[PDB]
Structure formats: C-alpha cells, structure tokens
Design a protein around this ligand. Structure first.
Ligand SMILES: *[C@@H]1O[C@H](CO[C@@H]2O[C@@H](C)[C@@H](O)[C@@H](O)[C@@H]2O)[C@@H](O[C@@H]2O[C@H](CO)[C@@H](O)[C@H](O)[C@H]2NC(C)=O)[C@H](O)[C@H]1NC(C)=O
Lengths: 224, 194, 210
C-alpha cells in the first residue's frame, strides 16, 4: 500500500529554519514526482515545489525560491524539504503529495501528470516568538440535560487532545477549536452534555494531553 | 496508555458494600507510585506482593473494587476474616494477591442529618464466596413462618443503611476502600508498570 | 501567473440536492485541472483528475466537466459525508490551487441550548477570571452572543470558537470565553450571556451572581 509518512510537528522562532521529511512506502519512490503543498490555518492550499528523485528534476514556486530546497535520498525512500528565514506567516501544515508519472505523446511532446493521488498526513510547523508552555486546566462546572467541561488555557504550541472519562465518554462531547490570544498562547474548551440525573451518579473527568510540553492533566469536573 | 486509577480513587461517591463496584483495568501502563507514596491512606496492606516491586511487574488484568464501610469494619477486608461485611457483603479469597487501601471519608460521605445512601446487607441465608456480589432485595426469613415476598414479623428487608453522621466516632465514620486484585493468566500481560 | 477562481465561496444545500461549483482559470489550461476534497481536519483527497476522470474509490455522485478556462464540479446527490472544502488545481504550467468552496448541509432550523460557566476557584487564585458561554447544537451557524456584565455590554475581552458541522445532526456548537482580571471580576455582580438565534422566539439569557 502506498503510504507517505511525514515528520513530527515542529516549533520554530522567527528567522530560524525547518527541515521536513516525507518517507515513501509501497511503490517505486524513485520514479514518482513528490510535490510539497502547505496550508495556513483556515486558508487555502498553496503549492511550493516538486522533486523527482531518480531524475533530480526540481522546480520551486516563485514565492519560496531562495528560501526553500527539496532533496531526496532514494536509499531511504524519503523526500526532504527545508524552508529557511521563517516568519510567523509560515505557520501552516505542510503536506507532501505524490503525482502520476509524466509522459510523452504521439508527437513527442512531454506532458506532466500532476494530479495528487496520494498525500501525507501533514506536518504542523508553528513559527512564533512564544516559547513552549503547558496548559492550565480549569473546570467548567454545572449548576433535564446538563453541560460540563474543561478550560485548556494558556498553552503553546498546538495541539492538545482532550478525552473524557479516560476515553469512555464520547457522546455529546464538543472539543472546540483553539484560539490564539494576544499573549501568543492558545486557549481551548471541551464540553459535554449529560443527563441532570447523572450529574450526581457519574464522575466526569477530562483528560488533557499536551505532547509538545509532555504535560498530562486529569481534572474532575464536579458540580459545585 | 495510563490506567484509569483516578476514576476509582477520586470518584465523587463510592458504591455501597453490598453493590460493590469493580473496574476492569486492561491495556494500559499503571504507575502505582501515585498510591504507595501518598500519606492520605490510613490502611495500605498488600498480600502476596510488595507495593514497591509492583512498578516493575506485569499482569493480565487488574481489578479495582470500590465500596464504603465504617471504620471498625475495615479489618474485615482481609483474607480469612469474619463479620457482616466479609460474610454478607464483600469477601476476599484466602490466597488473595493484591492490596487493600482505605481512608476516612467523613468529609465527603457524612451529612448533618446523616447520609442514609450507603447500605450494607445485614441478613443472608449463606455466607458469600470470594469476590461474589449480591444485589438482591428478597425478604429474609428470620423465623419459622414464611415471608412469601412481604415484610412482617421476623421477615425483614435484607439491606440496612449506614447512618453516617459527621459527629460519629472514628469507628462509625465512613471509610472509602479500594481493593486492587492482580490477575496473572496464561495470556498476554496487558497492565504493566513503568 | 495563472490565476484560478472558484464560485461560490461557500454553499449550503439539503441532503439529496444537486450541487454544482465552478472553477475558472485566467488562461487556457486545456483539460489539466483536478478537483480535491478536504474534510475538516484531514488531508486533501483527489476526486476528479483532468477535468472529467473520476478516481478509483470515489463515489459516482461526483462528476466533472470543462475545458479551456471554465470548469465545473458536480455532486449529483449531496450526502452528509460530503461536508468539506473543494479545491480545483491547474497544472498546464506549474501548479496553482483554487481558493476553495466550502460545502455545508442545509438542515432544519435548530435553536441552541445555552449554558454559562462561572470562573473556577482554581483560576481565581491565579489572578484571572474566565467566564464561558456554550451554545450547543444549533443551525444555522449565525448567532449573536452578547456578554452583559451588570447589563453593560462587554467588548474587547471576548473570543469565540465554532465547531464544524456535526457528523450526525449537522449542527454547530459555539464557545465564547470572557476573560477578566480578578480585580475587574470582583467589582461586578451579575454576569450574563445573551444569545440571539433564528430558532429562538426571543433572546435567551443565562446568568449568575458572583
Ligand atoms: C486523586 O487526586 C489527588 C488530588 O488531586 C488534586 O485535587 C483534585 C480535587 C483535582 O483538582 C486534581 O486536579 C488535583 O491535582 C491526586 O494527587 C495529586 O497529584 C498531582 C499529580 O501531579 C500532584 O501534583 C498533587 O500535588 C497531588 N495532590 C495531593 C493533594 O496529593 C491523586 O494523584 C489522585 N489519584 C489518582 C489515582 O489519580
């Protein structure tokens, strides 16, 4: 099976550089062009460049030429992209995608086949002057159907995973998208709707995991 | 990845003895250090294994049993013991391998009028077998005449409520108990310490 | 440089409706245009390649047409699993992606269930108070959330976050967070959340006293 495995998320300060990896499996990595496409949060897809390993054919976009470079190691079946002179606007998810093989037609003209049939899972690159910080978890307590939740406040960088009751409680849970505050730190809310009869009976614990900071917090949301 | 011990120890209230709660712990990594380093426990006795050697050990399944008894009944949560709790409510096996953990809960399970929500089985025709639970509400025949499903003279409801009051003595105060049982079977061990 | 536009920018249609979105290139890009689908939180997926060719594993309700500068993408019967943003992409010369078209499911109007949460004692010890208002399972997405502190409208201290359309009931949920200092929190009493939504016969206010 074709699989494009990308490197883990990266956090960088403005001006620094980042090197991302895209390991290919399940196909002849040498003969297929691999494109690099990025996507700012909530923004459109943006093509950056392509590179074919066996050919050495390389083409960058005008916006990233001079600060970008795409190489490959055919032995490791891995394509590398390196973006330099990073700025806050480079904060995005960077995908590697495999295109079809280019061809010649009846008259001898070279045609590319740059439709992306296989994508990697993407690598998040956060560029910010903020330093890595773990979240503080505060209970959102209830007073028919009741609502309770947790406040994941003042953490950096994204993301955070929030589960309820060690993974058991999943129905009625709404983990909201994070928002970037002016302090440069993220804040997030996770809520769940439960029956008011169960407000007593069941114990409700939210489990917050911030892998960037190796911070795991288990907070119980009890009615005050 | 991390075993859900906090769901058991730090729950808002515990079960009654007769309907003791059991949590099946599986496919996770357990750090018993959060338990054997705390000074919050009035009773921490382990049988067949030391708590210190638990963090480098592996078991197939681990069970966490929960209930609330009164203080002078905590000694009954031990192998080969007798009493209303051991005989009619919660019995440990004689070859029991695990830990008995208890702490006072007068601040949580006692009310000014009295917390009558915690119950225990007062009458039973036979003694419980190890790790057996009876949530029945059948009328008990304490005499010759049959009850036939209705309460009456020498025909009693089997369960009785602890009257947990904050002004009670320590032996009559509520105590929260967690019994960890460690099961090692001819199967892949799935609950492992660090 | 080749420019690629998409119309409409956003779209709402009921289940089973025929949906057609367009894509326009600034130059003749022949048939070298592909269509991608990106569900929320996932990577893009190729559905139509070279204007008309459906890719393997993609349902037959998806189609594509166009040549030269004008191209079209059609969903014959909109399904709830088709909530996503759809991009077109040319490759006649280099690669240029489109701005994208957000496709949503038009559902019956559903009013929100509103909840307000006071600041926790743990956070008040930190010197900061955060009041959180929750709007649960509502459609359409547009809703006004007004923070009223002693019936005084609060501005500049609020932040909002909306979930994506749910997999089952096709609804939205909204979280608003009012962050104050402990000093500013203790100089006021009534903290309220006023919510206006099409599914409500009148604004609903959830409040608490400090
Ligand atoms: C059971 O809870 C205690 C105490 O938890 C604290 O108080 C609760 C009301 C809730 O607000 C928790 O989030 C609090 O942490 C746990 O003991 C704490 O463990 C943390 C872990 O790092 C430590 O920082 C604290 O100092 C501990 N507090 C005390 C009073 O000991 C305990 O670990 C929980 N038990 C289990 C099995 O998870």
């Amino acid at each position: 099976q074709v699989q494009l495995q990308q490197s883990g998320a990266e956090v960088k300060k403005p001006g620094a550089s980042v090197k991302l990896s895209c390991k290919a499996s399940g196909y002849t990595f040498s003969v297929f062009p691999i494109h690099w496409v990025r996507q700012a949060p909530g923004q459109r897809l943006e093509w950056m460049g392509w590179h074919n390993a066996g050919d050495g054919d390389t083409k960058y976009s005008q916006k990233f030429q001079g600060r970008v470079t795409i190489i490959s190691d055919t032995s490791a079946s891995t394509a590398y992209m390196e973006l330099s002179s990073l700025k806050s606007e480079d904060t995005a998810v960077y995908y590697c995608a495999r295109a079809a093989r280019p061809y010649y037609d009846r008259r001898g003209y070279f045609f590319r086949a740059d439709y992306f049939q296989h994508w990697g899972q993407g690598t998040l690159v956060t560029v910010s002057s903020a330093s890595t910080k773990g979240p503080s978890v505060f209970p959102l307590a209830p007073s028919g159907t009741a609502a309770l939740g947790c406040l994941v406040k003042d953490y950096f960088p994204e993301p955070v995973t929030v589960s309820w009751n060690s993974g058991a409680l999943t129905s009625g849970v709404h983990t909201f998208p994070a928002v970037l505050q002016s302090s440069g730190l993220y804040s997030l809310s996770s809520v769940v709707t439960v029956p008011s009869s169960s407000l007593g009976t069941q114990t409700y614990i939210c489990n917050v995991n911030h892998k960037p900071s190796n911070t795991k917090v288990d907070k119980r949301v009890e009615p005050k | 990845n991390l075993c859900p011990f906090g769901e058991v120890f730090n729950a808002t209230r515990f079960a009654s003895v007769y309907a003791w709660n059991r949590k099946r712990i599986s496919n996770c990594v357990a750090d018993y250090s959060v338990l054997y380093n705390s000074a919050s426990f009035s009773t921490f006795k382990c049988y067949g294994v030391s708590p210190t050697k638990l963090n480098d050990l592996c078991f197939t399944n681990v069970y966490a049993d929960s209930f609330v008894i009164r203080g002078d009944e905590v000694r009954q949560i031990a192998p080969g013991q007798t009493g209303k709790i051991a005989d009619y409510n919660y019995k440990l096996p004689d070859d029991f391998t695990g830990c008995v953990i208890a702490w006072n809960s007068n601040n949580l399970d006692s009310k000014v009028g009295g917390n009558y929500n915690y119950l225990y089985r007062l009458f039973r025709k036979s003694n419980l077998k190890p790790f057996e639970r009876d949530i029945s509400t059948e009328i008990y025949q304490a005499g010759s005449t049959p009850c036939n499903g209705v309460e009456g003279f020498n025909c009693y409801f089997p369960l009785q409520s602890y009257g947990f009051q904050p002004t009670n003595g320590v032996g009559y105060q509520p105590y929260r108990v967690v019994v960890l049982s460690f099961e090692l079977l001819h199967a892949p061990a799935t609950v492992c310490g660090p | 440089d080749i420019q690629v536009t998409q119309s409409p920018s956003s779209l709402s249609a009921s289940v089973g409706d025929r949906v057609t979105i367009t894509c326009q290139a600034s130059q003749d890009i022949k048939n070298s245009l592909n269509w991608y689908q990106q569900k929320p939180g996932k990577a893009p997926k190729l559905l139509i390649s070279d204007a008309s060719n459906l890719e393997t594993g993609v349902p037959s309700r998806f189609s594509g047409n166009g040549s030269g500068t004008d191209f079209t993408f059609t969903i014959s019967s909109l399904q709830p699993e088709d909530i996503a943003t759809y991009y077109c992409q040319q490759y006649d010369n280099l690669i240029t992606f489109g701005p994208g078209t957000k496709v949503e499911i038009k559902r019956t109007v559903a009013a929100p269930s509103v909840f307000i949460f006071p600041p926790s004692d743990e956070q008040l010890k930190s010197g900061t108070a955060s009041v959180v208002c929750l709007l649960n399972n509502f459609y359409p997405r547009e809703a006004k959330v007004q923070w009223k502190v002693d019936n005084a409208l609060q501005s500049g201290n609020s932040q909002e976050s909306v979930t994506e359309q749910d997999s089952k009931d096709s609804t939205y949920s909204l979280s608003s967070t009012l962050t104050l200092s402990k000093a500013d929190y203790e100089k006021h009493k009534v903290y309220a959340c006023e919510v206006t939504h099409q599914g409500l016969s009148s604004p609903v206010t959830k409040s608490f006293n400090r």
